[PDB]
């Protein structure tokens, strides 16, 4: 009874990759092989492409990470021991309300603003990198727009809502426990963030993404004895694996997808999980002061 959960016998060949124009930068990384990764998936590692947008994104991101880490280490007076003790509790806090959207003093949130700007720039440059890498390989840019949804949520959390409130004071800090505490206090300040309906939609789409990527993973693993793992080939030439995958769900559920359209569902659930989340974040504080009172007004709560 085999399951295609682990690859008992592996194959290793001469590393090769799809052809790209040389460009200013070559492929970098001297590809190698790994055993556990080949047990769970492919064994080859790299090479990683590092173009102009890749260099720009890496430099901006590294600057942001170094600024954040330097501030975290400085907050505990440069003690490696006490840095270890408080690492989770350490955080680069955003500037206070009084400074508006302008530059705060470095100790009072200027470093947070500089780090956030550099991180935003690196994330956007990484988005451009995904777009350009997809276009270079003569492929579509679905990954870029799926990423753009996540960037929308990130910018709504960090920049857009501060713009609307005219204030970075309620932005999320750069810390492990501090950003969870920001989540908790954001929910408390605005009345039981469960009563945010776009939060409910985002949770529905997150649950649906997990559900869908368990359903689809189990379906492809169930038809992997029939060439079902080779999804694009079953999309261009429908084999019996795709037919049985469709008929299983048609018989158990009443309807079914295509090998191509199931990944459209997969794309859209993931994208909507963050799109509705960004909308719900942009709506709180600006339009809806208290989500519990909005729910009471609109029939979500028994009106105490």
């Amino acid at each position: 009874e085999y399951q295609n959960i682990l690859t008992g016998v592996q194959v290793r060949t001469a590393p090769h990759s799809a052809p790209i124009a040389k460009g200013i930068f070559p492929r970098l990384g001297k590809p190698g092989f790994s055993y556990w990764l080949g047990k769970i998936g492919d064994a080859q590692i790299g090479p990683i492409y590092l173009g102009t947008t890749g260099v720009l994104s890496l430099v901006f991101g590294f600057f942001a990470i170094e600024i954040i880490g330097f501030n975290l280490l400085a907050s505990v007076n440069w003690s490696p021991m006490e840095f270890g003790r408080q690492f989770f509790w350490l955080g680069l806090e955003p500037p206070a309300a009084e400074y508006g959207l302008g530059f705060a003093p470095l100790a009072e949130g200027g470093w947070w603003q500089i780090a956030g700007f550099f991180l935003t720039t690196s994330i956007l440059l990484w988005w451009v990198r995904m777009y350009r890498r997809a276009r270079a390989l003569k492929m579509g840019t679905h990954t870029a727009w799926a990423f753009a949804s996540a960037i929308f949520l990130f910018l709504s959390l960090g920049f857009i809502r501060p713009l609307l409130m005219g204030n970075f004071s309620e932005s999320v800090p750069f810390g492990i426990f501090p950003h969870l505490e920001w989540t908790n206090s954001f929910s408390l300040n605005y009345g039981n963030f469960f009563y945010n309906p776009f939060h409910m939609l985002s949770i529905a789409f997150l649950y649906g993404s997990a559900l869908l990527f368990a359903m689809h993973g189990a379906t492809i693993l169930a038809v992997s004895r029939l060439g079902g793992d080779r999804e694009v080939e079953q999309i261009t030439d429908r084999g019996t694996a795709a037919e049985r995958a469709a008929l299983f769900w048609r018989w158990t559920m009443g309807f079914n997808a295509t090998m191509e359209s199931i990944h459209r569902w997969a794309w859209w659930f993931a994208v909507l999980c963050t799109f509705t989340g960004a909308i719900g974040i942009l709506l709180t504080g600006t339009v809806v002061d208290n989500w519990f009172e909005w729910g009471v007004k609109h029939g979500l709560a028994p009106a105490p």
Binding site: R225, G239, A241, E243
Partner: protein, 256 residues
Amino acid sequence: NKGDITGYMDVAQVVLYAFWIFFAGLIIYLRREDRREGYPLEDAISGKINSLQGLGSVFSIARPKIFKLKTGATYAAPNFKRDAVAIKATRTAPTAGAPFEPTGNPMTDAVGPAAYALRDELPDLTLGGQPAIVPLRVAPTFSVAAEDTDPRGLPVVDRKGAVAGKVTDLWIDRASIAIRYLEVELAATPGRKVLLPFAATRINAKTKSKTVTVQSILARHFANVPTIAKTDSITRREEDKVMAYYSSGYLYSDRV
């Protein structure tokens, strides 16, 4: 008050209803994409184009999108190429919901879990315009990685323990580096050679000796495995046929 639009209606509610409209449209779009294979629906008995469908029918089926291949080929989705109503089976009851009694050996008649899609007779292509599923003999560069049992020469047995045959060669996918098939020479017929999918094997590297076992079909069922033509490059239809035959074992491996 601050966020209202008309008395009871406010901005958050309006954006919510806008999302609901967008999600209804998105569900329609996704269902249109779903209805790109196997559509339109046929009658369960006669096979005429019929189904309990409303005003959404005009929007149910999308125009055929065109897939371009790196050979000049083209696929149309949906292509309204359907299966024949008359299959090698008979209705248990004439009620359009009843299942089918096979009218023969369903292993070799391609009925039920043995049924295979009527694909095209072309091997999968690599980036270089060559077959992807090839035996290791005609791919000198490819080799089996170490730290894994080499499945060459190991006895091929069923669940009952009878030695169905012996493995001589491995067939692998060039596009994705992994073993696809084991070439098995029959202990009962040297002049016969069969392909057994790698997904249907247990490694069995931890026992008294090393052997390859199959839990689906019995030893005698290896005498009727579908054959292939080129013996060094296998078409999509041939591989789909072989995989369907092997997958049919679990349902009726002991007669019908």
